[PDB]
């Protein structure tokens, strides 16, 4: 249901999701990989749809994290485009696009896209 | 590639 | 560096972003379709490498809008992931994922996917 | 109709 | 392993995707929906990588179908594209595109995208 | 209709797509780089709506491209899928996925995405 | 939509 | 380098 997006979430290899949902559609929080580590975190901001459809539909939802901390700069950026789904056992399914910052030679291979099952699990 | 998203 | 990114960008089916880019890596504005006028206007929010490699390579950058304002509801967001090119014409290529909400057994078809080209028109 | 685009 | 991925597979969803891998690359054989019937099937073409690398990489391969047979035509194509890994437990890994034949003011809205996981259970 | 789409065929970035459209729905060729000649060329195989809606609706089709011929060998397929448009100049538009053999643990960077735009330039 | 590719 | 372009 709407704010239990709020909270922290795994992707299947390991990667941590923490967010925050504001009642009027925006989300906010951190990423970091598997290894830890205080500095694999980077920050996201989002928005979600704050009033979803009453039939038994999911929440759609977006995120962006441009891959810069402290620490490390990989020059790109990943969008992960889903909805979340409620239930006992609660997931958000997404699709996602990570393109780096290339020289025009290589603008043709910038764009790898995937997917990822996020659970509380 | 190997870049910070995953493992 | 966020002067050349922040702006008015229209694409080429003619929608509208106006979009800020903050010193921290934030990207903020609003989006538009082709229609014009407030209710089409949606906030979007992003994030840009803000710190980006020399060379003529692009700034990588990207953002999302939920597609909910004060008059409409689509129950679908967007997001958009690309490279901003500096020049004299500048230039933000991107490719788009729209997912809509579905039920269970229509997950399979909630995604579309495309492309969008912008150019950039005032600051 | 969808607003991304017209 | 190579010829490994001759047979039948299942994706998540039910559809069965039965396939014939040619000595020198290409893939042959037929789809078809759930619900069962001799005429969810339709026809599909493809090409694998008949001599994959010798560290322990997939098989990297790709498939259409066009929507289309003697009883049905949606006006679209799916390409699947993905690799194989061999093991106890084979699996075809995969993401597709669906394109739908539109009018040019329909054209932006044209494409979904998904992935796929096959097995032979 | 297949005479429109059988043809010599070329991209933005200068690769050639010959094709042959038979009656069944099938598609045989060659895809070509811009280096020209020989070995830059590869089969590729797809199918195409053989009955497309009337109206000024495309015709859907797709095919794929293992990147092994008898001189090299690079351990990826790509797959395009999109709509030929007839007119005076005919197109097609296409988004393709290219996927590289990996090890399992990389599994997750195994595919690029992008999109190209085909011109015609003889039967 | 509703299309042949799945159940 | 790939193939599918220059």
């Known amino acids: 249901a709407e704010a239990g997006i709020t909270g922290t979430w795994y992707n299947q290899l390991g990667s941590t999701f923490i967010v925050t949902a504001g009642a009027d559609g925006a989300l906010t929080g951190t990423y970091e990989s598997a290894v830890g580590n205080a500095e694999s975190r980077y920050v996201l901001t989002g928005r979600y749809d704050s009033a979803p459809a009453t039939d038994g539909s999911g929440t759609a939802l977006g995120w962006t994290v441009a891959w810069k901390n402290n620490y490390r700069n990989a020059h790109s950026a990943t969008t992960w485009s889903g909805q979340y789904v409620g239930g006992a056992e609660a997931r958000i399914n997404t699709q996602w696009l990570l393109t780096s910052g290339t020289t025009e030679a290589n603008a043709w291979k910038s764009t790898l896209v995937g997917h990822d099952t996020f659970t509380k699990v | ?7």
């Open chain 2, 1 to 7: 590639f190997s870049h910070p998203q995953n493992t």
